Design a protein around this ligand. Structure first.
Ligand SMILES: *[C@@H]1O[C@H](CO)[C@@H](O[C@@H]2O[C@H](CO)[C@@H](O)[C@H](O)[C@H]2NC(C)=O)[C@H](O)[C@H]1NC(C)=O
Ligand SMILES: *[C@@H]1O[C@H](CO)[C@@H](O)[C@H](O)[C@H]1NC(C)=O
Ligand SMILES: *[C@@H]1O[C@H](CO)[C@@H](O)[C@H](O)[C@H]1NC(C)=O
Ligand SMILES: *[C@@H]1O[C@H](CO)[C@@H](O)[C@H](O)[C@H]1NC(C)=O
Length: 606
């Protein structure tokens, strides 16, 4: 029968020492760890879990060496407490920086934020999945220990009068709570309701980490560089288990008896498609990934259909206009160095961007899986034709409008000039036109052309300086843009030019804009904020979010009506065309080519 051992983290090392013998100090054979802190485990799985406070990630590996996976890589700021729900097979964690308690599957999937309101600085975290309750300590404001159901609901404050508590442990069998008090230098205990409180040991120079096993409590002490042990009720029989161990971060006893109990999730995941979250009354509630919604069946989840995307130098973020005002999530996308522009294909659900470092057009799914480079040349802005499956983009080095198929196959250039310096671009494949910006020497223009480069016309001469971004709404029939030097956002009609200056007031440098549903969102780089304007019966200028550092682009996504999509002529096998597909006039199809080829007699091929 496998015996119990004690896990501890210190610097880059996670080590096991055998209890009942107090030796065999071996390290778990882990690679790539810089600074380990929070520890937990899964006995049935024989897996270990840890936090890296330096790299700001959460990882797992089999005890036996490895099947090492990074389980949470993005969105952590000051990750603190971390714990395994061994029944629902979910991973919980708390973050002091972002002020959120988050959950996900043990393999990192279906990440969801459980509590984010009224949280100051969440620290220690402890789970009771048998009873469906979670417990945490908060360090900000008036320090306290809280309780809530393991879905974030039914939140109460359990211990209102404590110092900064750090070692929060449940003794599952005897129904008690234990924590270290850093301010009062003592170990305290209470029952599950935070009553019948008692101090266990008070002569403590610097207590930090804490665990409970059988009759014993275990703690680490940074002042006397030790892992110490005592009787859980009297506090007597004090012994030094390990000395000369400075800065031991977390300790835990690994044993089957520490993960006992049962709930309704332990059997086939409560039939929930994604997350099964334990609840004190009604056993369980099916949960969903962030931004996703629970269906009528109280079982399956639906992905958000209408949302907003905004990018900065190192991250693409997604936001939704929620009833509960859900927080933004940082999309888990690898190798982002300097994002300059973004777009999104609503047909295959893929995110496209351009990295100005390594100068490439890259694409991935929202979960960060389908990673693929489309264009490998100094791209500036891009715009997707969702019907022809082409991406139109502008090159800064060659000053050209280039069109590439989504799978990376080249279609060709459609516009090049000796004087032309094309920059911002947005396509309108519904009317068969593209719109763009021309940053020519001393003389800038907002232009319009056919998707092939014909029917060119200058829409605006004066009132421009350095227009930087474009947007359009095919429903209403308007074109939007933002001027960087003049700090103003203007609006006009598609074919016509009904120039309105809707905002010109409190702006520093706008760098992006899009239309959501009936709102005009934009992004200010210096002011570091997102703002929106109402298009209909005005609700007035509204602040969306501030404190966003180095933001580059903003993009709106809408639910794609599959019935309305297949009715568009150019989506029906590109209208027969080998290259460019055009719609104009009576709403029929006409083929065209890039600049190195000509249309060939059958008016179909190049
Ligand atoms: C238009 O885009 C294509 C890629 O979609 C560019 O073609 C590449 O050009 C480089 C030369 O600089 C070659 O090494 C690659 O093999 C080409 N890729 C292909 C053919 O898929 C092309 O340069 C762009 N056009 C202009 C005028 O810049
Ligand atoms: C590691 O552990 C797993 C499960 O216990 C096992 O399947 C695998 O063979 C082990 N690998 C070793 C011992 O190299
Ligand atoms: C711990 O102390 C309690 C209370 O004095 C006692 O009942 C128990 O036997 C002790 N257990 C030990 C020393 O393992
Ligand atoms: C779950 O859906 C059922 C319909 O099957 C509905 O009656 C019920 O209100 C839902 N559950 C809860 C807890 O609201």
């Amino acid at each position: 029968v496998p015996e119990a051992f004690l896990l501890f983290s210190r610097r880059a090392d996670i080590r096991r020492i055998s209890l009942e013998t107090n030796n065999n100090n071996v390290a778990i054979p882990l690679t790539g760890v810089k600074e380990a802190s929070a520890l937990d485990f899964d006995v049935t799985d024989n897996r270990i879990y840890w936090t890296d406070i330096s790299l700001k990630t959460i990882s797992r590996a089999f005890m036996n060496g490895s099947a090492l996976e990074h389980v949470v890589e993005f969105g952590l700021d000051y990750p603190e407490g971390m714990a395994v729900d061994w029944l629902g097979k979910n991973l919980y964690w708390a973050d002091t920086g972002t002020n959120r308690i988050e959950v996900s599957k043990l393999d990192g999937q279906h990440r969801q934020v459980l509590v984010w309101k009224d949280l100051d600085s969440p620290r220690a975290l402890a789970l009771d999945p048998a009873e469906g309750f979670m417990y945490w300590t908060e360090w900000g404001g008036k320090p306290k220990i809280d309780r809530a159901a393991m879905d974030g609901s039914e939140r109460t404050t359990l211990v209102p009068n404590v110092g900064r508590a750090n070692g929060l442990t449940i003794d599952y069998a005897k129904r008690r709570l234990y924590w270290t008090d850093l301010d009062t230098n003592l170990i305290e205990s209470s029952n599950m309701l935070g009553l019948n409180r008692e101090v266990i040991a008070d002569d403590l120079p610097h207590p930090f980490g804490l665990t409970q096993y059988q009759d014993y409590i275990y703690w680490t002490d940074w002042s006397r560089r030790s892992i110490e042990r005592a009787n859980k009720t009297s506090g007597q029989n004090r012994t030094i288990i390990q000395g000369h161990l400075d800065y031991v971060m977390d300790i835990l006893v690994f044993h089957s008896s520490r993960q006992s109990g049962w709930n309704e999730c332990a059997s086939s995941n409560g039939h929930c498609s994604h997350l099964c979250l334990a609840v004190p009354v009604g056993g369980f509630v099916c949960g969903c990934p962030a931004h996703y919604s629970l269906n009528a069946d109280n079982r399956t989840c639906s992905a958000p259909t209408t949302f907003l995307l905004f990018s900065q130098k190192s991250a693409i973020n997604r936001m939704v206009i929620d009833e509960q005002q859900s927080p933004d999530i940082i999309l888990p996308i690898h190798s982002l160095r300097n994002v300059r522009a973004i777009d999104y294909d609503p047909l295959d659900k893929q995110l496209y961007w351009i990295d100005s470092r390594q100068n490439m057009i890259r694409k991935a799914q929202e979960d960060g899986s389908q990673g693929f480079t489309v264009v490998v040349i100094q791209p500036y802005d891009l715009s997707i034709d969702i019907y022809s499956r082409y991406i139109y983009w502008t090159c800064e080095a060659t000053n050209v409008i280039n069109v590439t198929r989504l799978d990376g196959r080249s279609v060709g250039v459609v516009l090049k000039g000796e004087q032309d310096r094309p920059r911002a671009i947005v396509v309108n494949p519904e009317k068969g036109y593209m719109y763009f910006t021309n940053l020519q020497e001393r003389s800038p223009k907002i232009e319009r052309a056919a998707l092939d480069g014909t029917e060119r016309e200058v829409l605006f001469f004066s009132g421009l300086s350095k227009p930087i971004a474009l947007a359009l709404d095919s429903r209403l029939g308007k074109l939007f843009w933002a001027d960087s030097d003049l700090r103003r956002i203007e609006s006009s009609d598609l074919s016509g030019a009904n120039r309105i200056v809707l905002e010109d007031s409190n702006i520093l440098q706008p760098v992006g804009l899009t239309v959501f549903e009936n709102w005009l969102y934009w992004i200010d780089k210096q002011q570091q904020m997102i703002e929106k304007i109402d298009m209909t019966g005005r609700e007035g200028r509204t602040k969306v979010q501030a404190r966003i550092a180095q933001l580059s682009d903003i993009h709106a996504v809408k639910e794609l009506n599959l019935q309305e999509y297949r009715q568009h002529p150019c989506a029906q096998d590109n209208g027969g065309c080998s290259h460019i597909c055009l719609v104009k006039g009576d709403g029929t199809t006409r083929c065209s080519c890039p600049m190195h080829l000509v249309l060939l007699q059958d008016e179909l091929s190049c």
